[PDB]
Swiss-Prot record, chain A:
ZnF RING-type span: 184-224
GO molecular function, one term: protein dimerization activity
BP GO terms, sorted: DNA damage response; double-strand break repair via homologous recombination
Function: RING-type zinc finger-containing E3 ubiquitin ligase that assembles with melanoma antigen protein (MAGE) to catalyze the direct transfer of ubiquitin from E2 ubiquitin-conjugating enzyme to a specific substrate. Within MAGE-RING ubiquitin ligase complex, MAGE stimulates and specifies ubiquitin ligase activity likely through recruitment and/or stabilization of the E2 ubiquitin-conjugating enzyme at the E3:substrate complex. Involved in maintenance of genome integrity, DNA damage response and DNA repair.
InterPro entries reported for this sequence: C1-like_sf, Nse1, Nse1_RING_C4HC3-type, WH-like_DNA-bd_sf, Znf_RING/FYVE/PHD
Subcellular location: Nucleus; Chromosome, Telomere
Keywords linked to the UniProt accession: Chromosome, DNA damage, DNA recombination, DNA repair, Metal-binding, Nucleus, Telomere, Transferase, Ubl conjugation pathway, Zinc, Zinc-finger
GO cellular component, one term: chromosome, telomeric region
Gene: nsmce1
Subunit composition and interactions: Component of the SMC5-SMC6 complex.
Name of protein: Non-structural maintenance of chromosomes element 1 homolog
UniProt family annotation: Belongs to the NSE1 family.
C-alpha cells in the first residue's frame, strides 16, 4: 500500500522495454530502481512492489505476471496485455499476413509432440496462407523479428513459443485451441514442451514429471501404464 | 569572431568513440547508448494478445 | 455520465496513447476525441486530463503538445535516462545514435544544414543514401521519411533554388525530447572539449 513513486515507474519502464525479465535480474532491477530514486530498498518487499504496480495497471488491462520457463525452470516476470478490443488491434508491430503466419506457426507448435516447428514447416505454412504471399527471405526476416521481440525462441532453425508468449497467451491458447492444447496433468497449465504418455497421450511439463515421479516403477497418472520417459 | 564547427574533426572523434581497420559490430549501439542519456524518450508498450484482426 | 463509464473511457485513452506511441508518430488530439472518447466528447478535457495524470503517476510519462495549431501530442520521459537505468539496448538505440549525429551537425552549423552537407558527413561514417546499410538498411528512407514523420527532423525545400534542393532543421519532437545545450554537451564529450569551448553555440543553447 505504498504510494506509487518513481522507483516503481523506473521498474515499469525497464520491464516495458524488455517485455520479459528473469527473476534474478528483476531482483537486481528492483534494488537499482530504489537506489536511483532514494527509496529505502527492502529486499523482502518485492511482491508488495510489483503489487503496487499491478493495482494501478489493472484498469489499463496490463499486468506484471510471473511464470516458469519450461526449459530452464527459472522464474520470469513479464508485462502482458490482458484485453482484446478495438484499441489493441491498432498495434503496429506486424502486418496482417505476418500475424496469420504467427498464428499458424503457434498452432503447429501447439499440435507438435516436441513443441517446436522447423524452418521448412513454417515455409510450407506461409505458402498455404490465404493472404498476401511472403517470399522465403521475408519469412526468414519475420522469424528473426519474432525471436528478437521474444515471441519465439529459435534453436538451429527450429522454433518454439517464448516464455513471454506462453505467459501472455496462456488463456487465449486454452480457449482458442481447447481441442488440441496440452494441459499438464499435474499443474493444469498449458504445456508446449512436455513428456507425453505414449499409451493415452496425456502431457506433463518436464519439471512436473520430475516432481511427480520423484519412484522405481513410475506409471501414468491417467492410464496407469508404466511411464516410458526418463525422470 | 564565431567558433566554427569542424564536421571532419567531428566524424574522426565519433569513429574513435565507436571503436576505430573497421568498425566493431556494436559501434552504432555504443553511440546510441551514449546518445540516449541526452534524450527524454519513453519506452513503448508491445504485446501479442489482442493485436490480431481479428 | 456515470463515473464508471467515464473511468472506463480514461483507461481506453491511456491504452490508445501507449499504442499510438509505438512508432513515435505524434498523436492528434482530434483523433483521441473522435476515435476513443466518442459520445463523451462534452467532457473530453477532463478525460484527457485524467489519462495524462495516469501516465504521469504510473509510467513516469509526460504528455506534451508539440504543435499548438494542430494540437498534436507526444509522450516524453519524466525520469532521467542514465547508464544502467535498466532499458533494453536494441535497434532503436542505434537509430538514436544516427539521429544525434545529424542533430549535432544541424545545431552546430547554426540550426540548419543542407541535405548535401548531411550525407557528406555521414559518408565518413560509412553511410551512403543509396546503399543498404548493415545497421540501418535504407538510410535515405530512415533519415528523410522516418525521422521526419516522427518530427525529429524537418526536411524542407530550399526556396528559389532552381534544381530542387533540400535542407534539414530540428523537428518539434527533438526540441521536446532533447535540447540545444544537451546536444552541445554530447558534441563536447565526443570531441574531448568543454561546452564553453564553443562560445557561439553555447550562447545559442542558453537562449
Ligand atoms: Zn505442469
Ligand atoms: Zn497414460
Amino acid at each position: 500500500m505504498d504510494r506509487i513513486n518513481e522507483s516503481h515507474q523506473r521498474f515499469l519502464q525497464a520491464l516495458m522495454s524488455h517485455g520479459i525479465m528473469e527473476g534474478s535480474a528483476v531482483r537486481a532491477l528492483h534494488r537499482h530502481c530504489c537506489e536511483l530514486h532514494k527509496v529505502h530498498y527492502m529486499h523482502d518487499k518485492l511482491d508488495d512492489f510489483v503489487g503496487v504496480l499491478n493495482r494501478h495497471l489493472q484498469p489499463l488491462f496490463m499486468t506484471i505476471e510471473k511464470g516458469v520457463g519450461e526449459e530452464d525452470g527459472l522464474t520470469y516476470y513479464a508485462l502482458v496485455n490482458r484485453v482484446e478490443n478495438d484499441i489493441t488491434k491498432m498495434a503496429s508491430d506486424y502486418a496482417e499476413n505476418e500475424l496469420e503466419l504467427f498464428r499458424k506457426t503457434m498452432e503447429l507448435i501447439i499440435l507438435s509432440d516436441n513443441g517446436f516447428a522447423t524452418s521448412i514447416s513454417i515455409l510450407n505454412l506461409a505458402d498455404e496462407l490465404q493472404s498476401k504471399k511472403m517470399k522465403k527471405k521475408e519469412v526468414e526476416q519475420l522469424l528473426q523479428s519474432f525471436v528478437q521481440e521474444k515471441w519465439l525462441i529459435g534453436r538451429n532453425g527450429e522454433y518454439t513459443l517464448h516464455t513471454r508468449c506462453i505467459m501472455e497467451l496462456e488463456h487465449y491458447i486454452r480457449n482458442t485451441y481447447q481441442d488440441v492444447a496440452k494441459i499438464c496433468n499435474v499443474c493444469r497449465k498449458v504445456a508446449i514442451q512436455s513428456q507425453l504418455c505414449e499409451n493415452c497421450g496425456i502431457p506433463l511439463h518436464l519439471q512436473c514429471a520430475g516432481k511427480y515421479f520423484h519412484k522405481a516403477n513410475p506409471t501414468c497418472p491417467n492410464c496407469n501404464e508404466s511411464w516410458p520417459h526418463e525422470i | 569572431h564565431m567558433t566554427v564547427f569542424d564536421p571532419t574533426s567531428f566524424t574522426a572523434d565519433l569513429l574513435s568513440f565507436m571503436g576505430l581497420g573497421y568498425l566493431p559490430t556494436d559501434a552504432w549501439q555504443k553511440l546510441g547508448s551514449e546518445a540516449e542519456n541526452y534524450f527524454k524518450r519513453t519506452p513503448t508498450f508491445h504485446f501479442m494478445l489482442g493485436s490480431f484482426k481479428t | 455520465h456515470s463515473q464508471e463509464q467515464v473511468n472506463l473511457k480514461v483507461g481506453e485513452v491511456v491504452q490508445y496513447l501507449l499504442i499510438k506511441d509505438q512508432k513515435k508518430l505524434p498523436i492528434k488530439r482530434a483523433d483521441i476525441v473522435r476515435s476513443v472518447i466518442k459520445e463523451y466528447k462534452d467532457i473530453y478535457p477532463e478525460i484527457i486530463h485524467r489519462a495524462q495524470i495516469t501516465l504521469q503517476q504510473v509510467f513516469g510519462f509526460q504528455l506534451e503538445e508539440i504543435d499548438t495549431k494542430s494540437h498534436i501530442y507526444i509522450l516524453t520521459n519524466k525520469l532521467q535516462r542514465v547508464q544502467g537505468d535498466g532499458m533494453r539496448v536494441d535497434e532503436n538505440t542505434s537509430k538514436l545514435g544516427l539521429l544525434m549525429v545529424i542533430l549535432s551537425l544541424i545545431f552546430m552549423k547554426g540550426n540548419t544544414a543542407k541535405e548535401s552537407a548531411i550525407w557528406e558527413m555521414l559518408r565518413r561514417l560509412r553511410i551512403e543514401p543509396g546503399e543498404m546499410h548493415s545497421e540501418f538498411g535504407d538510410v535515405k528512407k530512415l533519415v528523410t521519411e522516418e525521422f521526419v514523420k516522427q518530427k525529429y527532423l524537418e526536411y524542407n525545400k530550399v526556396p528559389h533554388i532552381d534544381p530542387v534542393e533540400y535542407e534539414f532543421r530540428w523537428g518539434q519532437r527533438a526540441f521536446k525530447e532533447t535540447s540545444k545545450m544537451k546536444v552541445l554537451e554530447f558534441v563536447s564529450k565526443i570531441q574531448q572539449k568543454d561546452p564553453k569551448s564553443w562560445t557561439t553555440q553555447y550562447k545559442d543553447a542558453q537562449e
